[PDB]
């Protein structure tokens, strides 16, 4: 597993450019923000629902504990 | 005759200038043959995106019939007197030279006057030539050396006319019409951009009379190119089916001017050249070549000095298998920085001798002499005498080589072009890191 015989691959041309001739933060905010928003939108509906459930049960459990120790009247 | 006296004994190149701007020049000798040809300043560097390939097309059409000489009749002349008619179009020069006998100069110049002025551009001939150029392009696609060099030019001068190839894209080849060809020849084949060189047994006054009798009715008394920009990049045409992997790495070098060319060539002479079918093998003074022969890293390698009017490419090109690209990149960069940081005196002396031999032996035979005349009156503006070359080589020492290599090699962004099984080829960051030494 070393460079030289990893695999076989043909008819691909890749162009690059020296790091000393191109910007290191190209449109970091012009295109960074829309990309971040799209990434967030892609995974929000599958990431949030478990954690919001966790928060709901956190509040429910804590408040039920505190209520259960209320002197009860009886 | 202690060498220097021999250099002085070389006859000089007399230079004249017609009223039309034709720089007629000639070098007289005693041989019974001659090589006379016009060098024009046309080429792909002066070709726009749509016109790209028109120079190659017009060079193709030049020999296939003129106005006064219809078709093969022109060729009928060239073979009848034993003349060899030849042409070549570089990215910045074009030339049509006719080897002939010293007694055939009056006719040969006439033929040249017909080739560059009264061309034919026959439409049916254009159609016949279009598929020929297409098949020639297909043939050159298999030329893994020319393809790599064109890749280097495209990836080094991207966004500039110098990136364009000589033949041009096939799209332009099929699109090009007669109007574009005649416009190109009328715009670029101007008298001030032409030099009528003639080496061999031709007397300069006879050449001047012939040029004034034939090349008189040329243009009176404009593409002047734009300074191209070097862009350190890389192209990787990964194709593992190819047997070997051609790699070419270059840096922005000097131009035809900028005398730094003379020391720089010496540095290249230090690196030298090698291939499998060489002689001494693991004994040649070049450490690169000695290591290559010792470990059989490659099948070939060379150091080029492609220099254009305002810029140029300086670097190496090696052909090796898929399993040894990294090692030769390492060794080539190591040799470059060894020259850059500590070039020693003995290697400089060897480079001076090698460069002396190159210039002296290259300029033998009427064809190389005439080509040198035509190319020098275009690039340098003057036929540089061999004595001046000797003096310029003599001025080169170890410190000069170290300084010039530091100026052009050390900490510079290179342009890389690899074709074939180039998976091993180190990423551009590793190459650029190899372009500087931490120890120094
Ligand atoms: C315990 C944990 C300890 C810490 C662990 C850290 C691990 C990662 C660190 C290494 C690293 O750089 O990872 C790559 C990762 C992303 O690298 P990148 O160069 O920004 O490229 C990301 C995409 O290729 C291109 O993304 P893009 O198209 O959105 O443009 C860049 C950027 C755009 O950012 C913005 O627009 C800024 C918004 C505010 O997007 C980002 O996500 C960068 C945020 C940087 C803060 O680094 C970071 O995100 C930097 C901070 C990482 C730590 C977490 C805090 C955020
Ligand atoms: C400190 C300033 C440098 C110095 O004093 O000597 C530089 C000198 C290397 O000079 P050079 O002109 O870069 O050598 C080029 C050769 O072709 C040798 O390098 P190469 O062409 O075989 O490979 C290129 C590149 C490949 O990259 C590396 O080898 C990576 C270096 C370590 C990066 C950090 C992550 C891995 C650990 O090599 C290096 O970066 C040199 C690695 C050794 C020096 C740095 C050691 C850092 C240790 C932490 O360092 C040594 O000879 C090692 C001992 C002295 C430095 C460490 C103490
Ligand atoms: C996210 C914003 C940046 C956060 C980090 C700031 C530290 C310094 C970063 C840096 O080196 O440059 C940041 C920025 C962009 O510079 P860049 O476009 O990469 O290169 C310009 C070259 N004239 O350039 C600048 O801030 C000033 C450039 C002058
Ligand atoms: C911590 C410092 C090392 C890690 C970060 C830098 C790195 O990985 O590489 C840069 C640095 C310089 O060396 P580099 O250019 O990689 O290779 C030698 C020159 N051909 O590599 C280094 O090792 C730099 C630090 C030692 C000198």
Coordinates of N, CA, C and O and ligand atoms in Angstrom, one line a residue, chain A residues 24-39, ligand 1:
Chain A
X24 N -5.8 32.1 0.0 CA -6.0 31.0 1.0 C -7.4 31.1 1.6 O -7.8 30.1 2.3
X25 N -8.1 32.2 1.4 CA -9.5 32.3 1.9 C -10.4 32.8 0.8 O -10.9 34.0 0.8
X26 N -10.6 32.1 -0.3 CA -11.4 32.6 -1.4 C -12.8 32.5 -1.1 O -13.4 31.5 -1.0
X27 N -13.4 33.7 -1.0 CA -14.9 33.9 -0.7 C -15.2 33.1 0.5 O -16.2 32.4 0.6
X28 N -14.4 33.3 1.6 CA -14.7 32.6 2.8 C -16.0 32.9 3.4 O -16.6 32.1 4.1
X29 N -16.5 34.1 3.2 CA -17.9 34.5 3.7 C -18.9 34.6 2.6 O -20.1 34.4 2.9
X30 N -18.5 35.0 1.4 CA -19.5 35.1 0.3 C -20.1 33.7 0.0 O -21.3 33.6 -0.2
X31 N -19.3 32.7 -0.1 CA -19.7 31.3 -0.3 C -19.7 30.4 0.9 O -20.3 29.3 0.9
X32 N -18.9 30.8 1.9 CA -18.9 30.0 3.1 C -20.2 30.0 3.8 O -20.7 28.9 4.3
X33 N -20.9 31.1 4.0 CA -22.2 31.1 4.7 C -23.3 30.3 3.9 O -24.0 29.5 4.6
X34 N -23.5 30.5 2.6 CA -24.5 29.6 2.0 C -24.2 28.1 2.1 O -25.1 27.3 2.3
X35 N -22.9 27.8 2.0 CA -22.6 26.4 2.1 C -22.8 25.9 3.5 O -23.3 24.7 3.7
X36 N -22.5 26.7 4.5 CA -22.8 26.2 5.9 C -24.3 26.1 6.1 O -24.7 25.1 6.8
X37 N -25.1 27.0 5.6 CA -26.5 26.9 5.7 C -27.1 25.7 5.0 O -27.9 25.0 5.6
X38 N -26.6 25.4 3.8 CA -27.1 24.2 3.2 C -26.7 22.9 3.9 O -27.5 22.0 4.1
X39 N -25.4 22.9 4.4 CA -25.0 21.7 5.2 C -25.9 21.6 6.4 O -26.3 20.4 6.8
Ligands
LIG1 C1 -12.5 18.0 21.5 C2 -12.4 18.7 20.2 C3 -11.1 19.4 19.9 C4 -11.0 20.1 18.6 C5 -11.1 19.2 17.4 C6 -11.0 19.9 16.1 C7 -11.1 19.1 14.9 C8 -10.9 19.8 13.5 C9 -9.7 20.7 13.5 C10 -8.9 20.5 12.2 C11 -9.6 21.2 11.0 O1 -9.2 22.2 10.5 O2 -10.6 20.5 10.5 C12 -11.2 20.9 9.3 C13 -12.3 22.0 9.6 C14 -12.8 22.6 8.3 O3 -11.7 23.1 7.5 P1 -11.9 24.2 6.4 O4 -10.5 24.6 5.9 O5 -12.8 25.3 7.0 O6 -12.7 23.6 5.2 C15 -14.1 23.2 5.3 C16 -14.7 22.9 3.9 O7 -13.7 22.3 3.1 C17 -15.2 24.2 3.3 O8 -16.3 24.7 4.1 P2 -17.1 26.0 3.6 O9 -17.4 25.8 2.2 O10 -18.3 26.2 4.6 O11 -16.1 27.2 3.8 C18 -15.2 27.2 5.0 C19 -16.0 27.6 6.3 C20 -16.9 28.8 6.1 O12 -17.0 29.4 7.5 C21 -17.8 30.5 7.5 O13 -18.4 30.9 6.6 C22 -17.8 31.1 8.9 C23 -19.1 31.1 9.6 C24 -19.1 31.7 11.0 O14 -16.8 26.5 6.7 C25 -16.4 25.9 7.9 O15 -17.0 25.0 8.3 C26 -15.2 26.5 8.6 C27 -15.5 27.0 10.0 C28 -14.3 27.5 10.7 C29 -14.5 28.1 12.1 O16 -11.8 23.0 10.5 C30 -12.7 23.8 11.0 O17 -13.9 23.7 10.9 C31 -12.0 24.8 12.0 C32 -12.5 24.6 13.4 C33 -12.7 23.2 13.8 C34 -13.1 23.0 15.3 C35 -14.6 23.1 15.6 C36 -15.1 24.5 15.7 C37 -15.8 25.0 14.4

